[PDB]
Amino acid sequence: ANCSIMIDEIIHHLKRPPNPLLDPNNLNSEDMDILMERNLRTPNLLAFVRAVKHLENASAIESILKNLLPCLPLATAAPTRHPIHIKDGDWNEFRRKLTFYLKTLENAQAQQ
């Protein structure tokens, strides 16, 4: 299989900013700690498969992330705080959240 390629490969489809708007599609400093917590990465995937349904033009991505849930490590196989929170479905929300997400995942998935 190639679960690792399914991660850095979506970063390719995660780089198309249209224009700056005033939409709520965005994460805060606390949400960043979520997508970064290796153990809290999969639960963000739960919010990535739900929001990607309302994310127009991201259905094929819902296929990747959903298949990526079991491809994540489990340092202390258990959650601690609430996971991420996407928006109505704007690529701007999944832009900062998902970019930093899939990236920190494959980064701590191997590391040397």
From Swiss-Prot:
It comes from Homo sapiens (Human). It comes from the Eukaryota. The chain holds residues 34 to 144 of 152 of the full protein. The gene is IL3. The keyword Ribonucleoprotein does not apply. Interacts with IL3RA. Coiled coil: none annotated. Belongs to the IL-3 family. One of its GO terms (cellular component) is extracellular space. This is Interleukin-3.
